[PDB]
DNA sequence: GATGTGGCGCAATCCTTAACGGACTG
DNA sequence: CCAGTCCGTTAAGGATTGCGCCACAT
């Protein structure tokens, strides 16, 4: 972007597009100078927009991105996101990498995969998705957040 | 912040219930750490009896047998 | 069918407040004792165990010389 | 009588972990 | 920018803890 968006700024394009819509950009960039018509309606539809749900997955929505990605496969996010009403595609490929994926094991953690990773960060060092190339059910999120608390 | 609003309401009756929990669980090891050191205190008791025991016996022989006349 | 806001009642919740700040740091203080004991007692345990096998090791040879005697 | 204990509800604090927000690659 | 991946950093909430009133045991 050209600087950083200010409240102000963030504020007066919440008022402008609620007015106009989300087809005028050309207009609503002229109230926002320093602003493009195109960083105006990313700056909304990416974040401002109230409509973007961002908080927990309803058995709902979890259920949902499974069937399709049963279906699909693992890929075109942003096409999956729109069966998910609020969300986007980079939310629904990670809660699928990390939570719904099948092969991801909630299961505790052991020592050996505790050793490995001990072993490996002090090799690797914050490598986490290649220190999950040695962990058969294991997404470097966990891996991360295990050593991140424990191995403090 | 205001205690009668229905928010603060539900944060009580949450942690209440987490506090409940927290100490629930820090008896029950409290206790289980107790009987293993009173199984461990009988066990000590019944492990050093019988090494009193062979050591008497073993001792005992020994003397048995370097008293063999020949 | 007491006064709260006495000046005695001041004084009685002090003492038993002291009380139990005594009763609770003696508490996690005898709880600490014990895990620790745990730990020497399976450490003493196992170190026996070795004892008696050793000793009931030394006591079948020493039974079997016996029997292996010229007779 | 007096002092010790075990519950309980607050309320400040700590810890765990989903998933947010940048930065990067093709 | 897109569509995927990585990764550091957050933050909503459960998990701990110390504090003081209390009913009841020693
Ligand atoms: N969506």
Same mark, same amino acid.
């Given at each position: 972007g050209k600087t950083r968006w200010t409240r102000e700024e963030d504020e007066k394009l919440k008022k402008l597009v609620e007015q106009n *819509?989300? #087809? #005028?950009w050309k207009v609503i960039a002229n109230y926002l100078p320093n602003r493009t018509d195109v960083q105006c309606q990313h700056r909304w539809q990416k974040v &401002?927009?109230?409509? &973007?749900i961002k908080g927990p997955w309803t058995k709902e929505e979890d259920q949902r991105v499974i069937k399709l990605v049963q279906k699909? *496969?693992? @890929?075109?996010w942003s096409v999956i996101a729109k069966?998910? @009403? *609020? =969300?986007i595609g980079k939310q629904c490929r990670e809660r699928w990498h990390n939570h719904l994926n099948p092969e991801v094991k909630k299961t505790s953690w052991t020592e050996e995969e505790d050793r490995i990773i001990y072993q490996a960060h002090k090799r690797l060092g914050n490598r986490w998705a290649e220190i999950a190339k &040695?962990?058969? *059910? =294991?997404?470097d999120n966990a891996i991360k957040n295990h050593w991140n608390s424990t191995m403090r | 912040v205001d205690k009668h609003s229905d928010e603060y309401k539900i944060r009580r009756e949450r942690n209440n219930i987490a506090v409940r929990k927290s100490r629930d669980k820090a008896k029950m090891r409290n206790l289980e750490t107790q009987h293993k050191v009173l199984e461990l205190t009988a066990e000590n008791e019944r492990l050093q009896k019988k090494v009193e025991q062979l050591s008497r016996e073993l001792s005992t022989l020994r003397n048995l047998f370097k008293q063999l006349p020949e």
């Open positions: *819509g989300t #087809d #005028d &401002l927009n109230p409509e &973007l699909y *496969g693992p @890929k075109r069966h998910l @009403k *609020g =969300r &040695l962990l058969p *059910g =294991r997404t | -």
